[PDB]
Amino acid sequence: AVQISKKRKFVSDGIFKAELNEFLTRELAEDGYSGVEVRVTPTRTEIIILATRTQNVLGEKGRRIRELTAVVQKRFGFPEGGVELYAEKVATRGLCAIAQAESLRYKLLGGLAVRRACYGVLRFIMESGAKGCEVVVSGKLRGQRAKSMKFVDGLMIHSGDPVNYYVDTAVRHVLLRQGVLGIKVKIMLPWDPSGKIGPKKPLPDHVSIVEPKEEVLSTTP
């Protein structure tokens, strides 16, 4: 065949992961889309979809799930039956940045209030368990002049390597009839020593020491 080189194979894979990500964030953003995970296996390409509500994505007898399976097989060139799509429901969506970023975006597009919707998600982030979150909305807020109001509560790490696996940042655009607004959501993941809830690796500044376990001094043999 074309004999795809490895330097161009990983790129062609990462673009398929990126283009499928953007296509679903513009199509499944209503059902609570959170991402996809791919597993390149010959004759069986399992492409799982992570959403908050999967009962509505299915349909009466799996109507919408058949379309997306027939959607990527025709745009990326997958054979008939050679691609299989699965839908999974995630938990504790308050830790997912893009889940909470699209959540308040669908409520800010109505002009109801920018302080009620922001405080509405701040409680769910803390209720689901988090070490701090961030909500930033910029643009012509409450006037023609551009105004930015930052909503901070808890803790937040900005520098270092742990910012990759301890805090996830999401950016979304707001389409209003008066202008354009931005949405910055920064959720901090709780340290889970197991690995099921969030990150397993602790912070570098987590020197916390175990107790000596009441070391007793012997008196006589």
Partner: protein
């Protein structure tokens, strides 16, 4: 300026599977999925454009491509135009 014979090949293919994918390029010679005919890319993006303006298909986009999905109303519009009985059902539905 769109012929009729190509209109059946674009709508019946969209009927057997309710998905139609086309690339946004007004200078493409032939559509990849429409290979048995010489249907240009204009006859795929403009003939489907009339379905969205009339509310017959839902479109999605990833930077170059259309992702069309026959709505429940649009399939009813194509059930009489393609001259098929009300008993058959597409593959997506």
């Amino acid at each position: 300026l769109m012929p009729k014979k190509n209109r059946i090949a674009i709508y019946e293919l969209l009927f057997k599977e309710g998905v139609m994918v086309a690339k946004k390029d007004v200078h493409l010679a032939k559509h990849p999925e429409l290979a048995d005919k010489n249907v240009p890319n204009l006859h795929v993006m403009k003939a489907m454009q009339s379905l969205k303006s009339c509310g017959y298909v839902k479109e999605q986009f990833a930077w170059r491509h259309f992702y069309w999905y026959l709505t429940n109303e649009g399939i009813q519009y194509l059930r009489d135009f393609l001259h098929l009985p009300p008993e058959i059902v597409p593959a997506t539905l």
